[PDB]
């Protein structure tokens, strides 16, 4: 799956970031914000 293009190690980690980290956090943080006084 590795590509010839330079910085070929960025997609290795960053797809995981976009895939699991970025959603899990924002999903969670949003879940907390609906919860409050009001």
């Amino acid at each position: 799956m590795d590509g010839s293009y330079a910085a070929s190690y960025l997609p290795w980690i960053l797809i995981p970031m976009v895939g699991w980290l970025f959603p899990a956090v924002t999903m969670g943080l949003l879940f907390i914000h609906i919860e409050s006084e009001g």
Binding site: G3, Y5, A6, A7, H33, I34, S36, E37, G38
Partner: protein
């Protein structure tokens, strides 16, 4: 501040209907609590700036990927 900060009508809704209707009425500023006419435009004006930036950020994405991973 419960979610829909901009609408106490929705904030009081004890059901899941709050979340959905909270999203669908988010960009209708005229419906917002205590929304004036002067405070309306000032939100639109700012909202446009954010939108323009996204377009320029988008086109940046195409150029950047073509230059990096494209056979141009």
């Amino acid at each position: 501040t419960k979610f829909p900060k901009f609408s106490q009508d929705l904030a009081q809704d004890p059901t899941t209907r709050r979340i959905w209707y909270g999203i669908a009425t988010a960009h209708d500023f005229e419906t917002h609590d205590g929304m004036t006419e002067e405070n309306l435009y000032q939100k639109i004006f700012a909202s446009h700036f954010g939108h323009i930036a996204i377009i320029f950020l988008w086109t940046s994405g195409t150029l950047f990927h073509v230059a990096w991973q494209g056979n141009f």
